[PDB]
Amino acid sequence: IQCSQRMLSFSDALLSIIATVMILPVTHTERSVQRLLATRIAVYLMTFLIVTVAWAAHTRLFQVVGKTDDTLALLNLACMMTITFLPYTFSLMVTFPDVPLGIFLFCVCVIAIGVVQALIVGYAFHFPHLLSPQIQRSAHRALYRRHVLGIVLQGPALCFAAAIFSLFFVPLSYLLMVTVILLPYVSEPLSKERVEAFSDGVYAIVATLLILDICEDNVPDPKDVKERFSGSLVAALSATGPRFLAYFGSFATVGLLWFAHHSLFLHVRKATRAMGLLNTLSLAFVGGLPLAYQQTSAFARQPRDELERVRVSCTIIFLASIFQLAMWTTALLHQAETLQPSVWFGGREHVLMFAKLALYPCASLLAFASTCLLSRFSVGIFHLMQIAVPCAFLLLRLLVGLALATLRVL
Amino acid sequence: IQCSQRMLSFSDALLSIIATVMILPVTHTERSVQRLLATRIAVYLMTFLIVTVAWAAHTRLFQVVGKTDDTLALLNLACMMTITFLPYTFSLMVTFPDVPLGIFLFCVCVIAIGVVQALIVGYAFHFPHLLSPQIQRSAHRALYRRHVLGIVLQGPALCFAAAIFSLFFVPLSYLLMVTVILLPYVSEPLSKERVEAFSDGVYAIVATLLILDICEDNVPDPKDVKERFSGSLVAALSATGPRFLAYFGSFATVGLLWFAHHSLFLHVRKATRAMGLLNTLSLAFVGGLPLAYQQTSAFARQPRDELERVRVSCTIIFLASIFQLAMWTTALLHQAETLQPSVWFGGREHVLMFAKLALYPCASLLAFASTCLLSRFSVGIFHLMQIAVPCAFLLLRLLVGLALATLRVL
Ligand SMILES: CCCC[C@@]1(C2CCCC2)Cc2cc(OCCCc3nnn[nH]3)c(Cl)c(Cl)c2C1=O
Ligand SMILES: CCCC[C@@]1(C2CCCC2)Cc2cc(OCCCc3nnn[nH]3)c(Cl)c(Cl)c2C1=O
């Protein structure tokens, strides 16, 4: 039989994309404009959370299922196809909260996902040699199968209840639906490889969103160049320059955030559900960076507009990195089982890692405060941080050594 | 010191996105239409080939420098930031071969890639422990360093020469440019994990192009639905049904191709550069499937139109699969060095592996011949191939035995 690892990777390489799809409507967007933008942000966040919950269920499922073969791979592909429709169905439901057809479609999506997962469980247990070794030696194989089936089919059951009740009173259906996401929390390790794969996929997609847009839209047209720019191609490129600047900033920020994430996870011994939650929040907010940078690159009709956009960029960068730092703190709370020895309290790289993770929250906080105190140079300082933070990463060892030496003579 | 697996995987995801970026205009496409689409397809194929050459150079580089470091990771991020621009500048250069600015831009991009990689080499050799263990042993560290810089910089030099020549005679510049890819072939293992990661990224993005499109475009507007269908939302869904069917077909075909590729590579021990070439061709043609399914879902003004649309779809599937089959046969040609014993000639799964691969190209060829012989049912037969091939993959392990059973009674 097969080594399941690669297959799971592909699933993540799929789910990441499905998780991030609803970002694109946000970027392409221009009481009317602001409300619409906020609606798109809310829809994107909810879709990302839903896809993350589905991914968590998948990760647990294939944690139980150790090895795989042909039929398991095909059923996993079918499950992936069913999960791919969650963004679209959810968007339909939200855009049409009145008619029951939308909630019915979303509930059918969830039901299909859970049914495929239950079929996978049944096939795996019918061939115990596929299951993980601890499950194989589990004397509760029948009871364990019963419990796993209950867990997997709870979601579909609640969704079926919501669908039936939608024909009469939809609020009950909505409550039953949120129950699906609530109960698994209300009534554990996430295999590090799965978390790493999903996070890397999300980071890559978010980093290359803006170049995707640029290649799809900005490539000059010879007719346009000859007519509007009178054949001066360099003028045509300088016209779209701002999108290049925004992409440069987005790639810098997202790449350095991924660098901090990589440094953190290199020393993590054993992930946890709490770290999973915090990582999910961190990624959901990392998704916002391209929007912030697009807004920054755009014109500012009034000083207040530019100040507000700088505020938003700083706030997004903060929210993105603060949860990443909180992951590290939560790990420190269970240091013995969570983190490598080299990053324990007083460890050789403990302070270095702390600075590496806290570099972005602190810089963003200073930039945000600049708006409340130094509105004169506010935007400028923002630009400065965009160049300051990368440099500190190159010099991080020397910078931390300087800080420690300064504290020595304090 | 770090383990480079995750950093390489993230870089591979980035490069997959960059390579498959240029397909988006092809799908978004509607003597004028035909020529425009031909130009788009040529642009896409050349962009994919050039980005794969860049990825191949990257793979060799990070084969030589095994371990990594924070500063080296940042250098790699900088390298990716420039490799990401190859699509845009190549498209611009193809759009503006007349003016020297576009060729200069492409040239500076390639020289930037080369100089970043040269810095990586210099740093790796300034810290010998970062090199791969066998290289660390090499008594030729000096001469091998010189050779590595020679291979890395062969491009940059030729591109610089072409950029200089662009001001006087552009044909010489283009000849020098193509010499960059000519020389390495005219005057080796590709690390398997890199090949699997790149192929998984390609397949994952290609399978979900269509749903990505659907999420942004087909969500009905309530202001539109209320009028166009008097609140009949199901009418709106049925209006776009064909797009959903196109997505279903695209995902099924792409996922089953990924299943064949995964089963192939799980038995592959060392991917030879020939295998890399064949995989590049296979992925490049796998890119086309979304276009094929979009064309198939589109209306047919005349029977000739639908016939030709079936022909092109079948040709694309046939190419995408026959290249994998050719990779498999080339592997058989060196099974002793490349393939696991289990799939060697006369192996237990040898017949199973061969059938698994050859299932799709043969089906496409049969559906193609149906047009030349059975035009009456041709289109239906194509749909049959969309239904049969999935089941054939489910029942393959049985079906092959059935076939063998025939060869026992015959
Ligand atoms: C030599 C250090 C360069 C480091 C990075 C690399 C990103 C990933 C690791 C390094 C990050 C970065 C930020 C930049 O700031 C963009 C602000 C936009 C603007 N416009 N006017 N003023 N500021 C610019 Cl410009 C550049 Cl080139 C670069 C890079 O290459
Ligand atoms: C029951 C197993 C089927 C396997 C797959 C899954 C894809 C990924 C792994 C399995 C593939 C597939 C192809 C289809 O073909 C599309 C019909 C196009 C049409 N029909 N009428 N007119 N045009 C349909 Cl329908 C479906 Cl359901 C499915 C699946 O679920």
Short mmCIF file of C-alpha atoms in Angstrom, two decimals, chain B:
data_model
loop_
_atom_site.label_atom_id
_atom_site.label_comp_id
_atom_site.label_asym_id
_atom_site.label_seq_id
_atom_site.Cartn_x
_atom_site.Cartn_y
_atom_site.Cartn_z
CA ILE B 1 21.12 25.52 10.90
CA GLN B 2 17.69 24.48 9.61
CA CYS B 3 15.99 21.61 7.85
CA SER B 4 15.30 22.87 4.34
CA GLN B 5 12.26 20.68 3.58
CA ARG B 6 9.59 23.24 4.44
CA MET B 7 11.39 26.15 2.81
CA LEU B 8 11.82 24.11 -0.37
CA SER B 9 8.15 23.10 -0.27
CA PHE B 10 6.99 26.70 0.09
CA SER B 11 9.28 27.74 -2.76
CA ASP B 12 7.82 24.93 -4.87
CA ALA B 13 4.28 26.10 -4.16
CA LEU B 14 5.33 29.62 -5.13
CA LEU B 15 6.92 28.42 -8.37
CA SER B 16 3.87 26.30 -9.21
CA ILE B 17 1.63 29.35 -8.84
CA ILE B 18 4.02 31.44 -10.93
CA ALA B 19 4.22 28.84 -13.69
CA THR B 20 0.45 28.32 -13.86
CA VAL B 21 -0.34 32.04 -13.59
CA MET B 22 -0.46 32.65 -17.35
CA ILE B 23 -3.35 30.21 -17.93
CA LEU B 24 -5.87 32.61 -16.38
CA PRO B 25 -6.26 34.85 -19.47
CA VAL B 26 -6.70 31.72 -21.59
CA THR B 27 -9.72 30.60 -19.56
CA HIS B 28 -10.99 34.18 -19.27
CA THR B 29 -10.79 34.45 -23.07
CA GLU B 30 -14.14 34.73 -24.85
CA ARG B 31 -8.53 35.36 -37.61
CA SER B 32 -9.20 37.65 -34.64
CA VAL B 33 -10.49 35.25 -31.96
CA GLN B 34 -8.46 32.30 -33.25
CA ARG B 35 -5.22 34.28 -33.59
CA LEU B 36 -5.75 35.93 -30.20
CA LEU B 37 -6.28 32.58 -28.48
CA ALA B 38 -3.30 31.07 -30.29
CA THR B 39 -1.14 33.94 -29.05
CA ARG B 40 -2.45 33.41 -25.52
CA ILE B 41 -1.73 29.68 -25.62
CA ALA B 42 1.78 30.21 -26.99
CA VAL B 43 2.45 32.79 -24.29
CA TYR B 44 1.23 30.39 -21.62
CA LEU B 45 3.33 27.47 -22.85
CA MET B 46 6.52 29.51 -23.20
CA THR B 47 6.00 31.10 -19.77
CA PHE B 48 5.50 27.69 -18.19
CA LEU B 49 8.61 26.31 -19.88
CA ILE B 50 10.80 29.23 -18.78
CA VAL B 51 9.51 29.12 -15.20
CA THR B 52 10.17 25.38 -15.12
CA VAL B 53 13.73 26.03 -16.29
CA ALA B 54 14.10 28.48 -13.40
CA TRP B 55 12.67 25.90 -10.98
CA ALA B 56 15.07 23.29 -12.34
CA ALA B 57 18.05 25.58 -11.70
CA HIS B 58 16.69 26.23 -8.20
CA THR B 59 16.43 22.49 -7.54
CA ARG B 60 20.05 21.87 -8.51
CA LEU B 61 21.17 24.81 -6.40
CA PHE B 62 19.41 23.57 -3.28
CA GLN B 63 20.64 20.07 -3.98
CA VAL B 64 24.20 21.37 -3.70
CA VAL B 65 23.58 23.50 -0.59
CA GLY B 66 21.73 20.98 1.56
CA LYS B 67 21.32 22.72 4.90
CA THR B 68 20.00 26.28 5.16
CA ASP B 69 20.05 29.28 7.47
CA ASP B 70 17.86 32.34 8.28
CA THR B 71 20.01 34.59 6.06
CA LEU B 72 19.95 31.95 3.33
CA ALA B 73 16.18 31.66 3.71
CA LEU B 74 15.87 35.42 3.23
CA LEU B 75 18.08 35.20 0.14
CA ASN B 76 15.78 32.47 -1.19
CA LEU B 77 12.77 34.70 -0.54
CA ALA B 78 14.48 37.46 -2.52
CA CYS B 79 15.13 34.96 -5.33
CA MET B 80 11.44 34.03 -5.38
CA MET B 81 10.45 37.70 -5.44
CA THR B 82 12.23 38.04 -8.80
CA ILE B 83 11.32 34.63 -10.23
CA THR B 84 7.71 35.71 -9.71
CA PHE B 85 8.14 38.45 -12.33
CA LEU B 86 9.24 36.18 -15.19
CA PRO B 87 5.66 35.71 -16.49
CA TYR B 88 4.83 39.41 -16.63
CA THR B 89 8.05 40.55 -18.29
CA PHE B 90 8.05 37.66 -20.76
CA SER B 91 4.48 38.54 -21.73
CA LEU B 92 5.48 42.19 -22.10
CA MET B 93 8.50 41.30 -24.23
CA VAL B 94 6.37 39.10 -26.48
CA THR B 95 3.88 41.97 -26.74
CA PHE B 96 6.61 44.53 -27.48
CA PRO B 97 9.51 42.84 -29.31
CA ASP B 98 10.02 46.05 -31.30
CA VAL B 99 11.10 48.30 -28.43
CA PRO B 100 14.21 47.44 -26.39
CA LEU B 101 12.60 48.23 -23.03
CA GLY B 102 10.68 44.95 -22.81
CA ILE B 103 13.62 42.75 -23.73
CA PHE B 104 15.73 44.75 -21.29
CA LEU B 105 13.14 44.12 -18.56
CA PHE B 106 13.10 40.37 -19.15
CA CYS B 107 16.89 40.38 -19.23
CA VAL B 108 17.20 42.27 -15.93
CA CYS B 109 14.76 39.83 -14.35
CA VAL B 110 16.84 36.83 -15.42
CA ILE B 111 20.12 38.48 -14.37
CA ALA B 112 18.55 39.34 -11.00
CA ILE B 113 17.61 35.69 -10.53
CA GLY B 114 21.14 34.69 -11.47
CA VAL B 115 22.88 37.18 -9.17
CA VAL B 116 20.71 36.20 -6.21
CA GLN B 117 21.56 32.55 -6.84
CA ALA B 118 25.24 33.51 -7.16
CA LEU B 119 25.07 35.20 -3.76
CA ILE B 120 23.51 32.03 -2.38
CA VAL B 121 26.41 29.98 -3.78
CA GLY B 122 29.01 32.38 -2.40
CA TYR B 123 27.45 32.34 1.05
CA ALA B 124 27.09 28.55 1.02
CA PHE B 125 30.79 28.16 0.20
CA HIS B 126 31.74 30.80 2.78
CA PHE B 127 30.09 28.51 5.37
CA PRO B 128 31.10 25.00 4.28
CA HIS B 129 28.99 23.17 6.87
CA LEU B 130 25.81 24.30 5.07
CA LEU B 131 26.76 22.24 2.00
CA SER B 132 25.51 18.73 1.34
CA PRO B 133 27.58 16.14 3.24
CA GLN B 134 29.23 14.64 0.15
CA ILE B 135 30.10 18.10 -1.19
CA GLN B 136 31.61 18.99 2.18
CA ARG B 137 33.93 16.02 1.60
CA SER B 138 34.87 17.14 -1.92
CA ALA B 139 38.56 18.04 -2.09
CA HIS B 140 37.63 20.12 -5.16
CA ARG B 141 35.69 22.71 -3.14
CA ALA B 142 37.58 25.44 -5.01
CA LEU B 143 37.11 24.02 -8.51
CA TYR B 144 33.59 22.83 -7.74
CA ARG B 145 32.74 26.31 -6.47
CA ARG B 146 34.04 27.74 -9.73
CA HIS B 147 31.96 25.24 -11.71
CA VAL B 148 28.81 26.05 -9.71
CA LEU B 149 29.28 29.77 -10.33
CA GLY B 150 29.92 29.00 -14.00
CA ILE B 151 26.67 27.07 -14.40
CA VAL B 152 24.67 29.62 -12.41
CA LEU B 153 26.08 32.65 -14.23
CA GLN B 154 26.04 31.19 -17.76
CA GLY B 155 22.56 32.65 -18.08
CA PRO B 156 23.17 36.12 -16.66
CA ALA B 157 26.13 36.64 -19.00
CA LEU B 158 24.19 35.66 -22.12
CA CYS B 159 21.19 37.75 -21.09
CA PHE B 160 23.44 40.75 -20.45
CA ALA B 161 24.98 40.31 -23.90
CA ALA B 162 21.51 40.11 -25.43
CA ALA B 163 20.38 43.23 -23.57
CA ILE B 164 23.40 45.13 -24.87
CA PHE B 165 22.79 43.89 -28.41
CA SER B 166 19.10 44.85 -28.23
CA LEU B 167 20.02 48.47 -28.98
CA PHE B 168 21.56 47.50 -32.35
CA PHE B 169 20.20 44.15 -33.64
CA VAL B 170 17.49 42.32 -31.69
CA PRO B 171 17.75 38.98 -33.59
CA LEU B 172 21.18 38.43 -32.06
CA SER B 173 19.75 39.23 -28.63
CA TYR B 174 16.98 36.65 -29.07
CA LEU B 175 19.50 34.08 -30.31
CA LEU B 176 21.64 34.69 -27.23
CA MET B 177 18.56 34.44 -25.01
CA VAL B 178 17.61 31.03 -26.39
CA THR B 179 21.25 29.99 -26.06
CA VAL B 180 20.69 30.02 -22.29
CA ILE B 181 18.41 26.99 -22.57
CA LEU B 182 20.41 25.54 -25.47
CA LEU B 183 23.73 25.31 -23.61
CA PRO B 184 22.83 23.16 -20.56
CA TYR B 185 21.36 20.45 -22.81
CA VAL B 186 24.12 20.61 -25.43
CA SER B 187 27.26 21.45 -23.43
CA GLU B 188 21.20 13.61 -13.32
CA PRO B 189 18.66 13.08 -10.52
CA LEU B 190 16.03 15.70 -9.79
CA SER B 191 15.29 15.35 -6.08
CA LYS B 192 12.02 13.43 -6.11
CA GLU B 193 10.32 15.48 -3.39
CA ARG B 194 10.77 18.65 -5.44
CA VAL B 195 9.14 17.03 -8.47
CA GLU B 196 6.21 15.74 -6.43
CA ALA B 197 5.71 19.12 -4.77
CA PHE B 198 5.78 21.00 -8.07
CA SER B 199 3.40 18.55 -9.75
CA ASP B 200 1.03 18.59 -6.78
CA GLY B 201 0.93 22.38 -6.83
CA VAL B 202 0.25 22.39 -10.56
CA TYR B 203 -2.53 19.81 -10.33
CA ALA B 204 -4.12 21.47 -7.30
CA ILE B 205 -4.24 24.90 -8.95
CA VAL B 206 -5.46 23.52 -12.29
CA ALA B 207 -8.25 21.47 -10.71
CA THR B 208 -9.69 24.58 -9.04
CA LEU B 209 -9.31 27.29 -11.69
CA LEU B 210 -12.96 26.80 -12.61
CA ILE B 211 -14.40 26.96 -9.09
CA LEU B 212 -12.22 30.02 -8.51
CA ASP B 213 -13.92 31.62 -11.51
CA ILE B 214 -17.39 30.53 -10.37
CA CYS B 215 -17.02 31.98 -6.88
CA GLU B 216 -16.19 35.44 -8.25
CA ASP B 217 -18.64 35.52 -11.20
CA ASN B 218 -21.69 33.28 -10.95
CA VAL B 219 -23.05 34.24 -7.53
CA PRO B 220 -26.42 35.68 -8.63
CA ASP B 221 -27.28 39.26 -7.75
CA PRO B 222 -30.54 39.44 -5.75
CA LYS B 223 -31.35 42.64 -7.62
CA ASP B 224 -30.80 40.59 -10.78
CA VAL B 225 -32.65 37.46 -9.63
CA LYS B 226 -35.72 39.38 -8.43
CA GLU B 227 -36.28 40.73 -11.96
CA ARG B 228 -34.83 38.17 -14.37
CA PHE B 229 -36.65 35.25 -12.70
CA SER B 230 -39.26 36.96 -10.47
CA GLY B 231 -37.48 35.55 -7.42
CA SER B 232 -36.99 32.08 -8.92
CA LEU B 233 -33.43 31.45 -7.75
CA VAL B 234 -33.41 27.88 -9.08
CA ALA B 235 -33.86 29.37 -12.54
CA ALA B 236 -30.67 31.37 -11.99
CA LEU B 237 -28.84 28.22 -10.90
CA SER B 238 -30.05 26.32 -13.97
CA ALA B 239 -28.90 29.24 -16.12
CA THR B 240 -25.26 28.66 -15.10
CA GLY B 241 -25.55 24.88 -14.71
CA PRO B 242 -23.21 24.38 -17.68
CA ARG B 243 -20.37 26.10 -15.81
CA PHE B 244 -20.85 23.73 -12.87
CA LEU B 245 -20.77 20.77 -15.25
CA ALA B 246 -17.56 22.12 -16.79
CA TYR B 247 -16.02 22.40 -13.33
CA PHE B 248 -17.09 18.85 -12.49
CA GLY B 249 -15.51 17.46 -15.65
CA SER B 250 -12.33 19.46 -15.18
CA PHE B 251 -11.92 18.39 -11.56
CA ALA B 252 -12.63 14.75 -12.35
CA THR B 253 -10.09 14.62 -15.17
CA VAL B 254 -7.40 16.58 -13.33
CA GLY B 255 -7.81 14.62 -10.11
CA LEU B 256 -7.70 11.28 -11.90
CA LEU B 257 -4.57 12.38 -13.74
CA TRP B 258 -3.11 13.29 -10.35
CA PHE B 259 -4.08 9.84 -9.09
CA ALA B 260 -2.25 8.20 -11.99
CA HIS B 261 0.79 10.42 -11.43
CA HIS B 262 0.78 9.71 -7.69
CA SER B 263 0.58 5.95 -8.22
CA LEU B 264 3.42 6.21 -10.74
CA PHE B 265 5.71 8.22 -8.49
CA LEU B 266 5.09 6.20 -5.33
CA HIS B 267 7.01 3.40 -7.07
CA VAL B 268 9.66 5.72 -8.55
CA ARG B 269 13.01 5.77 -6.75
CA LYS B 270 15.00 8.42 -8.69
CA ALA B 271 13.59 10.90 -11.20
CA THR B 272 16.12 11.24 -14.02
CA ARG B 273 16.38 14.45 -16.03
CA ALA B 274 14.47 12.67 -18.78
CA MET B 275 11.70 12.10 -16.24
CA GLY B 276 11.88 15.80 -15.40
CA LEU B 277 11.47 16.75 -19.06
CA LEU B 278 8.50 14.43 -19.51
CA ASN B 279 6.90 15.70 -16.31
CA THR B 280 7.33 19.28 -17.49
CA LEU B 281 5.60 18.46 -20.76
CA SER B 282 2.84 16.56 -18.95
CA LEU B 283 2.13 19.46 -16.60
CA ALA B 284 2.28 22.03 -19.39
CA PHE B 285 -0.39 20.13 -21.30
CA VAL B 286 -2.39 19.37 -18.14
CA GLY B 287 -2.79 23.12 -17.92
CA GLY B 288 -5.07 22.99 -20.96
CA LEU B 289 -7.89 20.88 -19.51
CA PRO B 290 -9.92 23.80 -18.07
CA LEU B 291 -9.94 25.37 -21.53
CA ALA B 292 -11.07 22.09 -23.08
CA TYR B 293 -13.96 21.71 -20.64
CA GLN B 294 -14.98 25.35 -20.98
CA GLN B 295 -15.12 24.91 -24.76
CA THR B 296 -17.08 21.67 -24.41
CA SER B 297 -19.65 23.28 -22.12
CA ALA B 298 -20.09 26.13 -24.61
CA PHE B 299 -22.86 26.02 -27.19
CA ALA B 300 -22.33 24.61 -30.69
CA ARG B 301 -23.48 26.70 -33.64
CA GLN B 302 -22.75 23.87 -36.10
CA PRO B 303 -22.00 20.15 -35.77
CA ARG B 304 -18.51 20.85 -37.09
CA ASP B 305 -17.94 23.18 -34.13
CA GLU B 306 -18.87 20.62 -31.47
CA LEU B 307 -16.94 17.92 -33.33
CA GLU B 308 -13.79 20.05 -33.38
CA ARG B 309 -14.35 21.00 -29.71
CA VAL B 310 -14.43 17.26 -28.85
CA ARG B 311 -11.33 16.70 -30.98
CA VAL B 312 -9.30 19.38 -29.20
CA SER B 313 -10.42 18.27 -25.75
CA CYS B 314 -9.50 14.67 -26.54
CA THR B 315 -6.15 15.78 -27.95
CA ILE B 316 -5.35 17.71 -24.77
CA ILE B 317 -6.22 14.76 -22.52
CA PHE B 318 -4.29 12.42 -24.80
CA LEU B 319 -1.16 14.56 -24.64
CA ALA B 320 -1.40 15.12 -20.89
CA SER B 321 -1.62 11.36 -20.34
CA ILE B 322 0.72 10.05 -23.05
CA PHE B 323 3.54 12.16 -21.67
CA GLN B 324 3.10 10.47 -18.29
CA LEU B 325 3.02 7.12 -20.09
CA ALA B 326 6.26 8.03 -21.86
CA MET B 327 7.81 8.92 -18.52
CA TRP B 328 6.70 5.52 -17.23
CA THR B 329 8.23 3.70 -20.21
CA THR B 330 11.47 5.67 -19.96
CA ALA B 331 11.52 4.60 -16.32
CA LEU B 332 11.07 0.98 -17.40
CA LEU B 333 14.12 1.49 -19.62
CA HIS B 334 16.19 1.88 -16.42
CA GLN B 335 13.98 0.11 -13.87
CA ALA B 336 17.17 -1.25 -12.29
CA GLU B 337 18.09 2.31 -11.28
CA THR B 338 14.79 4.22 -11.25
CA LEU B 339 11.83 1.97 -10.32
CA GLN B 340 10.99 -0.18 -7.33
CA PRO B 341 11.22 -3.96 -7.87
CA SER B 342 7.45 -4.20 -7.34
CA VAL B 343 6.85 -2.53 -10.73
CA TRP B 344 9.76 -4.08 -12.61
CA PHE B 345 9.01 -6.22 -15.65
CA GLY B 346 6.95 -9.17 -14.50
CA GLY B 347 6.25 -7.45 -11.19
CA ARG B 348 3.06 -7.96 -9.23
CA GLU B 349 1.77 -4.44 -9.97
CA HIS B 350 3.60 -4.01 -13.29
CA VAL B 351 0.44 -4.78 -15.26
CA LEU B 352 -1.61 -2.81 -12.74
CA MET B 353 0.68 0.22 -13.03
CA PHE B 354 0.72 0.11 -16.83
CA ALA B 355 -3.07 -0.17 -16.99
CA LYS B 356 -3.52 2.63 -14.45
CA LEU B 357 -1.48 4.96 -16.63
CA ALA B 358 -2.66 3.86 -20.08
CA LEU B 359 -6.34 3.99 -19.11
CA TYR B 360 -6.91 7.73 -19.88
CA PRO B 361 -4.82 8.22 -23.16
CA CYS B 362 -6.48 5.18 -24.74
CA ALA B 363 -9.95 6.42 -23.77
CA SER B 364 -9.18 9.84 -25.24
CA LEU B 365 -7.84 8.25 -28.43
CA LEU B 366 -10.97 6.12 -28.79
CA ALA B 367 -13.23 9.12 -28.27
CA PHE B 368 -11.14 11.00 -30.86
CA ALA B 369 -11.51 8.21 -33.43
CA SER B 370 -15.25 8.22 -32.73
CA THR B 371 -15.39 11.67 -34.33
CA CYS B 372 -13.72 10.37 -37.50
CA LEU B 373 -15.92 7.25 -37.63
CA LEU B 374 -19.02 7.75 -35.43
CA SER B 375 -19.77 11.46 -35.68
CA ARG B 376 -23.44 10.76 -34.94
CA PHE B 377 -22.79 9.81 -31.29
CA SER B 378 -19.34 11.42 -30.98
CA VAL B 379 -20.30 13.99 -28.35
CA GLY B 380 -22.17 11.40 -26.30
CA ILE B 381 -19.19 9.07 -26.48
CA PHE B 382 -17.03 11.83 -25.01
CA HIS B 383 -19.45 12.11 -22.09
CA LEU B 384 -19.26 8.33 -21.82
CA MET B 385 -15.48 8.59 -21.48
CA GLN B 386 -16.07 11.11 -18.69
CA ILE B 387 -18.22 8.56 -16.86
CA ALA B 388 -16.40 5.33 -17.71
CA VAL B 389 -12.84 6.38 -16.82
CA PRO B 390 -13.67 7.21 -13.17
CA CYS B 391 -15.35 3.83 -12.67
CA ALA B 392 -12.49 2.13 -14.51
CA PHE B 393 -10.16 3.60 -11.89
CA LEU B 394 -12.38 2.33 -9.06
CA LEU B 395 -12.60 -1.17 -10.56
CA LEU B 396 -9.13 -1.21 -12.14
CA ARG B 397 -7.65 -3.71 -9.69
CA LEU B 398 -10.58 -6.00 -10.45
CA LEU B 399 -10.74 -5.15 -14.16
CA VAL B 400 -7.09 -6.01 -14.76
CA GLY B 401 -7.68 -9.39 -13.16
CA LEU B 402 -10.69 -9.85 -15.41
CA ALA B 403 -8.46 -9.03 -18.38
CA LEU B 404 -5.92 -11.55 -17.08
CA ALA B 405 -8.76 -14.04 -16.66
CA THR B 406 -9.44 -13.61 -20.38
CA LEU B 407 -5.78 -14.36 -21.14
CA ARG B 408 -6.28 -17.56 -19.11
CA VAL B 409 -9.31 -18.83 -21.05
CA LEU B 410 -8.05 -17.66 -24.46
#
